Amino acid sequence: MPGTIKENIIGVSYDEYRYRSVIKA
Description:
By secondary structure, the chain is mainly α. The protein has one helix and no strands. The protein has one helix at residues 6-20. The protein is rod-shaped and about 40 Å long. It starts with 5 loop residues before the first helix and ends in a 5-residue tail after the last helix. It is found in: Apical cell membrane; Early endosome membrane; Cell membrane; Recycling endosome membrane.
């Protein structure tokens, strides 16, 4: 990842957020 360290988190957070208050069913 010589040039994909931040472009990767944008995808990891896009989920944790959409998963932060939704999994708790």
